[PDB]
Design a protein around this ligand. Structure first.
Ligand SMILES: Cc1cc(N2CC[C@@](C#N)(C3CC3)C2=O)cc(NC(=O)Cc2ccccc2)n1
Ligand SMILES: Cc1cc(N2CC[C@@](C#N)(C3CC3)C2=O)cc(NC(=O)Cc2ccccc2)n1
Ligand SMILES: O=C(C[C@H]1NCCC[C@@H]1O)Cn1cnc2ccccc2c1=O
Ligand SMILES: O=C(C[C@H]1NCCC[C@@H]1O)Cn1cnc2ccccc2c1=O
Ligand code: PRO
Ligand code: PRO
Ligand SMILES: [Cl-]
Ligand SMILES: [Cl-]
Ligand SMILES: [Cl-]
Ligand SMILES: [Cl-]
Lengths: 486, 486
């Protein structure tokens, strides 16, 4: 299978082909659920190991809470269990959409003293959000894998520092592992987590459809949940005070974002840092050659590379041509391929082809390990810098509302001065929705056309005094990133 | 909190105290579900890492399949989802009790050629079995964490070899990691997995209540599921043949078995190979001492031990006495404690106390790392050998049915010659159930009294010719292990 849809022409068909023909996903009879095959699951394991190691250094501990929540606990897009076999439960129980109402009664019991704080827990599990909108493999599904962390602190300042530290870990998850550039920012009051005080986010951008997408999230819950669940601690005075809480999560959406960011017309391109196969060795196996010698040297090279921690597989299958194998591992996104035939063996070199650019190198066997390490770092860096340039070109800085629709029609995000009044965001969503529908009827034309806030970026351009809001004309408070979204 | 119930007197109360006061579990409002706190979850992560590494060496790959299964797919103790919010789904969908019916349609699609075999997949997830019997934390719960592996092979012999290789991994999981002795064997026709051809098992034994328990399971499914799901492959001839399948699983039940096996009146005893804290360092901190010097040496020793891969924590909390800390870490089962005070510092030694026997050692700082490594191996081995001696003393070899009830009253298993006729197992279950109820009414007295087969052990004692079945008098075929069970 080759990918035949072009990424810049039919992006939806291209994406489906890339994830199916690489054997990353399989479809399923229940809408919005997808099977995650090993080729994709290996990447999830890699980013999971990364994030787990990092939060353990912060003193976060893993745990496991039940997948079921009582009606009363939850009620204090949800799939309800109502019967065991054909017997009706007295109270129906819900499948977790998130675990605040499952965990926080326990927290209230566990926390008594300032000596019990901070309390830092995480769990890896799946959650269920049963919407009816258009599902997208990896990006927006009814069941998905995630991690959710939940912490409790004696002070707001300590909780806020943790929120930001986790957000930095999510920046590293995307930018350092997956080579996807993200924008750190704060959500608007309309878009933040309802029961929380402040929601921070990293946002990603999909150029081919112009859409922003929330990559991960980190919430300062403050004391609201502590009030509702009576999570209190005693200082050394003996005075009871509410804890200050955080929660934060990130999902297999990250994989989809990586796929969309780096893929090309040939299929997947997997950044070397998360590729389960970094180097595929393809021996050339003529009938009229010493095949034993060539396969032996491939095994020697595999051992030599694995001593440098390079993840290698040899595709020595005799029933497929080298051309078939080149395409097979290109579709799967292996970042380097190493070709070895009798002429290479005679010269003591190997031919290495990088997946992102197709550039080829002749490398002597003694230089192979350090040169491939350097090449993989270069591939990783180049994937990131090109995605970052696409991000910067995808954002238009505007000053008035009449620049919105043209910028959206170019599939761009807009960075605009905003008064942050929450009524104005609703007005903007509804107006851009209506104008988008008009434009659709003029084009002769599934996913919403409305523009919403994506985030208020931590990195703020200058704000000249007396800059007006781009929609209300009221005095503008901060630069805000807007766009169509998932 | 100290444990105050005695293990040999009130075993159920002892178990609850040990797992609650060590902070391993927390209760939950839904019967049969329990929260797994970090102290327990760390042990699960350890055995998970072990088993994952081992099966990856066998070429098994992890994956993730949805938690939901359609009514038709399943129907081809189950919790049914029937509504999203308060809207009724056209077909109700079930939460997975096991994933054969979720995975095998996909297998049928993926397998076309002998070149596609073997196919070896595993997943780590939770499943739901919604029974109403008495739940037991770790051992028998409505939701539990497990791994389930599913493989497909071109021949029965290859599938059978895999079944046995996995069963050996489960023996290692219990005996090598958890120091719990298990018995490998084959399940009776009445107790085997229904749709499979042959079920193998490792069985454990709980002496304090006399009960056997299935520790893990590995099934030769053969071609039955291949028939039902039309999983076929083509040889190089072009003839379509059914695949031969296996499936195998093991759960957090293993943790409960470990707890019950090694615990004592003081609480948990965690084998060093899975203990998240292997050595706890407790500084003695008099008011009238150079506390800075003692804490500094504790940190030096921690660094030195961690260079030998020993997992160390220092409990330098000033507001608790050393006696309090000794009990606190004993209850949690830390296998070694290291005490350091001014006199030790003056002598250049440390006092080390092993959790299992309470024996103390004075060890010079230079010998500390290799001596503690040797001590931990000795602790691990001694935990295992004492549990193995308890297992051997808990099994009575009998020849006639009238020895059954006395052996059961001694809380023993029986090894008996058996005709393996399936009707006889039902008769034996019902008769021993009835006799147990009579005995209960004579004692002035929740869990079933019936005796069933636990397994037909791979290791068979000699079978003198003409040995009769202990219940039917028919010619006996093999020695069978029987007992009361979970
Ligand atoms: C795969 C994935 C991811 C996420 N979300 C949420 C926000 C978040 C972030 N950031 C989580 C907090 C961490 C994220 O990734 C959400 C989802 N499904 C849904 O909303 C349900 C759905 C299904 C079909 C169509 C529309 C909606 N599906
Ligand atoms: C914790 C745990 C474990 C296991 N089982 C099963 C066999 C197996 C083995 N071997 C699995 C194949 C791997 C195992 O461990 C099973 C369970 N709950 C249940 O049966 C449901 C239940 C709940 C309350 C009372 C009675 C029954 N709960
Ligand atoms: C955060 N979040 C997200 N989605 C949900 C869906 C249903 C119920 C609660 C939630 C919820 O809390
Ligand atoms: C194995 N196993 C065990 N338990 C179950 C419970 C309900 C339905 C199917 C199963 C099942 O298949
Ligand atoms: O869903 C959310 O956004 C928060 C963060 C993870 C748990 N709850
Ligand atoms: O439940 C069982 O016993 C088998 C083995 C794991 C998956 N199904
Ligand atoms: Cl291969
Ligand atoms: Cl900030
Ligand atoms: Cl501590
Ligand atoms: Cl055998």
């Amino acid at each position: 299978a080759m990918v035949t849809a072009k990424k810049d022409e039919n992006f939806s068909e291209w994406y489906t082909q890339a994830i199916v023909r690489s054997e990353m996903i399989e479809y399923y009879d229940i809408s919005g659920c997808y099977i995650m095959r090993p080729w994709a699951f290996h990447i999830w394991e890699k980013v999971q190991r990364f994030f787990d190691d990092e939060i353990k250094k912060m003193g976060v501990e893993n745990s496991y809470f039940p997948m079921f929540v009582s009606r009363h606990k939850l009620e204090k897009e949800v799939a309800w269990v109502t019967h065991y076999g054909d017997s009706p439960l007295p109270e129906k129980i819900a499948i977790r959409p998130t675990s605040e109402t499952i965990m926080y009664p326990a927290y209230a019991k566990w926390i008594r003293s300032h000596r019990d704080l901070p309390l830092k827990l995480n769990q890896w599990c799946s959650v269920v959000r049963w919407e009816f909108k258009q599902p997208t493999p990896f990006l927006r599904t009814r069941e998905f894998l995630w991690q959710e962390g939940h912490t409790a602190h004696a002070t707001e300042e300590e909780a806020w520092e943790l929120v930001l530290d986790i957000l930095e870990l999510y920046r590293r998850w995307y930018e350092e592992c997956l080579a996807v550039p993200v924008i750190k920012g704060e959500k608007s009051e309309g878009e933040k987590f309802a029961g929380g005080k402040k929601t921070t986010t990293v946002e990603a951008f999909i150029p081919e459809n112009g859409r922003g997408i929330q990559a991960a999230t980190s919430h300062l819950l403050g004391t609201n949940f502590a009030k509702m669940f009576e999570i209190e601690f005693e200082d050394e005075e003996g005075h009871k005070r509410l804890v200050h809480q955080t929660s934060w999560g990130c999902t297999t959406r990250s994989l989809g974002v990586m796929i969309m960011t780096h893929g090309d017309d040939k299929g997947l391109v997997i950044p070397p840092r998360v590729a389960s196969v970094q180097v595929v060795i393809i021996p050339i196996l003529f009938k009229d050659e010493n095949t034993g010698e060539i396969l032996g040297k491939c095994r020697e090279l595999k051992t030599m590379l694995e001593k440098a921690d390079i993840r290698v597989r040899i595709d020595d299958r005799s029933n497929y041509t080298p051309g078939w194998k080149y395409n097979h591992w290109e579709v799967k996104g292996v970042p380097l391929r190493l070709e070895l035939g009798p002429k290479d063996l005679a010269k003591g070199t190997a031919r290495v082809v990088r997946r992102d650019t197709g550039e080829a190198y002749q490398i002597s066997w003694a230089d192979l390990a350090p040169k491939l390490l350097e090449l993989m770092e270069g591939i990783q860096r180049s994937l990131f810098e090109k995605a970052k340039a696409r991000l910067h070109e995808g954002i238009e800085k505007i000053s008035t509302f009449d620049e919105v629709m043209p910028a959206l029609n170019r599939k761009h995000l807009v960075l605009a001065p905003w008064c942050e009044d929450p009524e104005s965001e609703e007005q903007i969503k509804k107006e851009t929705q209506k104008l988008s529908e008009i434009q659709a009827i003029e084009a002769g034309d599934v996913m919403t056309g409305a523009m919403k806030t994506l985030c208020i970026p931590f990195d703020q351009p200058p704000m000249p005094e007396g800059t007006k809001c781009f929609y209300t004309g009221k005095p503008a408070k901060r630069w805000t990133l807007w766009g169509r979204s998932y």
